[PDB]
Design an enzyme around this catalytic site. Structure first.
Site, PDB file in Angstrom:
ATOM      1  N   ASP A   1       0.842  -1.165   0.000  1.00 12.06           N
ATOM      2  CA  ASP A   1       0.000   0.000   0.000  1.00 12.06           C
ATOM      3  C   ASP A   1       0.880   1.219   0.000  1.00 12.06           C
TER       4      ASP A   1
ATOM      5  N   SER B   1       2.384   6.959  -0.496  1.00  5.68           N
ATOM      6  CA  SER B   1       1.652   6.332   0.565  1.00  5.68           C
ATOM      7  C   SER B   1       0.269   6.380   0.029  1.00  5.68           C
ATOM      8  N   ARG B   2      -0.237   5.211  -0.410  1.00  2.84           N
ATOM      9  CA  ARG B   2      -1.465   5.120  -1.154  1.00  2.84           C
ATOM     10  C   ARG B   2      -2.585   5.082  -0.157  1.00  2.84           C
ATOM     11  N   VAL B   3      -2.234   4.966   1.139  1.00  4.50           N
ATOM     12  CA  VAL B   3      -3.144   4.945   2.245  1.00  4.50           C
ATOM     13  C   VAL B   3      -3.170   6.328   2.844  1.00  4.50           C
TER      14      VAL B   3
END
Lengths: 50, 58, 501
Positions: free
Chosen positions: C341, C366-368
């Site tokens: 993620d 940071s895809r979160v």
């Protein structure tokens, strides 16, 4: 303390070589015969209990 | 000591520690020279003070 | 002495076995045995070879069941009998793993006596479902300001630390563990992350230095160290992440929050490769068997922020992948990149450039996102992203060295100072409450003026100054965790006051 701990390990490996000496003694004896009979009858009791 | 099974060397060095509870000798190492330097100095301090006080009023 | 009690215990193990399954070793070699028999045999089962070697069984064939030894074959020999344990591989899991180094089979290799185990668990355990998961909302602060600002860490997130070989590779991760001392020491159990550092493929000396470092910072009092040194078997190495995962799950299950560092998965892939190719499985893409993606994915998906009905549990994961020559198109790096993620790309050139920690901010995502970033820190670092992005563009133009316009040099000057601001001393993370001011200063351009050379001096001094005067302010930043108008004004004034030192 360090030598004391080392001495316990040293005692254990020393006593280990005595196990080897004892192993040679057991397998030399006609305990080699007599305990095979014990194992044999134990297998009779066990496998019959199956 | 309860760690060390090897007997009576913890009691030895414990007792050796209790022997060496005493410490090196020394106390007030200046009480004549600290006072002497301070005396000469104090005199000088007062000299400066008196001169400048006079000059201030002048 | 101790010997007499041990011998008594040994005498105390007797009682015949009924060995309901047997099989005779035949083809054995390369540490990968194959036995004929074992008509009953569960898959992934642990089988005790009669020689005191235990080996899990990974291939069931209608001839010869292929039992991968966990030992060396110098104790195994042809035609041995093997007795099926009758238990699929399992590890003791418990609180006692805290402050213990343990090998794969859960033997303390630091020999701090037998593990105090509250259970045993199984190596493969299915990942938390869609239904038992609630969205992440709990920050995790690594104490590396660049990390916190750019790629914020939360709980239940998987973020991949990727980059060139041992560029203090372990150290980047170790810093995170170290900053968790601040909360961990604290009694807030809702901020307690029990930390599990998993070390696969590293030599005993490396591991020993690490555990020593952890003891030096006295952080080992919350660490669990799962180790599988390079001496230890390739099957044990393959099994090593999965048994670490279960150890983590005990914390996760208890609802207690935790973080598991899986350093380095790249060596797991080598291990699985060895294992597969001597299980004679068809060679996969790039020689890594084609089910490595499945292997890694199932491992990685077991870290999650469990639902509030599941007591808000959360195992957090940080995988670490070494990129060989920085090749990001290699099959194993590609596979991991997809699973995770985040990317926390570390760049060697920037390391050499002296930007340590070294992060290529373009290759880091940071895809979160900032759902797990501290609310205060989000406000301050709001345009930090924009500034850095502008700096990157500007820097590219600047290489050509054409006479830059003032707008470009505003960026350039600001950017240079920001880069110096990011830098931090290895093995010395900084408190987030005292990272928020530094970013405020930078973003509010006070440091843009301040000369590049003395930025490092300024940073040290600024902290001292805030400690001296605005320590009321610092307390508020910790306490309220969002900068209110009053805090923003206080902070603005403080920074302004400290501009001329």
């Amino acid at each position: 303390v360090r030598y004391e701990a080392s001495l316990r390990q040293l005692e254990q490996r020393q006593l280990a070589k005595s196990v080897i000496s004892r192993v040679q003694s057991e397998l030399g004896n006609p305990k080699f015969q007599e305990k095979v009979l014990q194992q044999s009858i134990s297998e009779i009791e066990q496998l019959l209990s199956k | 000591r309860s760690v060390l099974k090897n007997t009576s060397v913890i009691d030895k060095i414990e007792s050796y520690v209790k022997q060496y509870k005493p410490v090196k000798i020394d106390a007030s190492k200046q009480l004549q020279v600290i006072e002497s330097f301070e005396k000469h100095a104090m005199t000088n301090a007062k000299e400066t003070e008196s001169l400048v006080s006079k000059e201030l009023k002048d | 002495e101790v010997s007499s009690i041990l011998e008594e215990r040994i005498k105390g193990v007797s009682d015949e076995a009924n060995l309901n399954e047997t099989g005779r070793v035949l083809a054995v070699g390369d540490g990968i045995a194959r036995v004929f028999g074992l008509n009953n045999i569960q898959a992934e089962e642990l089988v005790e070879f009669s020689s005191g070697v235990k080996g899990m069984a990974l291939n069931l064939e209608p001839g010869q069941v292929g039992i991968v030894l966990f030992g060396s074959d110098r104790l195994v020999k042809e035609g041995e009998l093997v007795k099926r344990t009758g238990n699929i591989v399992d590890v003791p899991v418990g609180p006692g793993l805290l402050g213990r180094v343990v090998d794969a089979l859960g033997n303390p290799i630091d020999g701090k006596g037998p593990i105090d185990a509250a259970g045993r668990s199984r190596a493969q355990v299915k990942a938390p479902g869609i239904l038992p998961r609630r969205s992440v909302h709990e920050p995790v602060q690594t104490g590396l300001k660049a990390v916190d600002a750019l790629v914020p860490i939360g709980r239940g997130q998987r973020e991949l630390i990727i980059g060139d070989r041992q560029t203090g590779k372990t150290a980047v991760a170790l810093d995170t563990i170290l900053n968790q001392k601040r909360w961990n020491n604290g009694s807030d159990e809702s901020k307690k992350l029990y930390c599990v550092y998993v070390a696969v493929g590293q030599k005993r000396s490396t591991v020993a230095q690490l555990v020593q470092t952890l003891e030096q910072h006295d952080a080992m009092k919350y660490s669990i160290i799962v180790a599988a040194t390079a001496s230890e078997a390739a099957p044990l190495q393959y099994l090593a992440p999965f048994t670490a995962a279960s150890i983590g799950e005990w914390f996760r299950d208890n609802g207690k929050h935790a973080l598991i560092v899986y350093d380095d998965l790249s060596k797991q892939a080598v291990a699985y490769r060895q294992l597969s190719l001597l299980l004679r499985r068809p060679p996969g893409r790039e020689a890594y068997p084609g089910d490595v993606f499945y292997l890694h994915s199932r491992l990685l998906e077991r870290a999650a922020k469990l639902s509030e009905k599941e007591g808000s549990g959360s195992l957090t994961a940080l995988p670490v992948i070494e990129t060989q020559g920085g090749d990001v198109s290699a099959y194993i790096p590609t596979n991991v990149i997809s699973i995770t993620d985040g990317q926390i790309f570390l760049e060697a050139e920037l390391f050499y450039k002296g930007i340590r920690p070294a992060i290529n901010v373009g290759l880091s995502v940071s895809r979160v996102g900032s759902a797990a970033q501290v609310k205060a820190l989000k406000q301050v670092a709001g345009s930090l992203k924009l500034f850095l992005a502008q700096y990157r563009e500007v820097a590219a133009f600047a290489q050509f060295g054409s006479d830059l316009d003032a707008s470009t040099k505003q960026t350039l000057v600001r950017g240079e100072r920001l880069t110096q601001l990011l830098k931090q001393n290895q093995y010395s993370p900084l408190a987030t409450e005292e990272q928020v001011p530094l970013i405020y200063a930078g973003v509010n351009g006070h440091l843009d003026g301040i000369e590049l050379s003395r930025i490092g001096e300024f940073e040290s001094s600024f902290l001292s100054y805030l400690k001296s005067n605005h320590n009321e302010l610092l307390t508020e930043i910790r306490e309220k965790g969002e900068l209110s108008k009053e805090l923003l004004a206080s902070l603005k004034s403080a920074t302004e006051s400290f501009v001329a030192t």
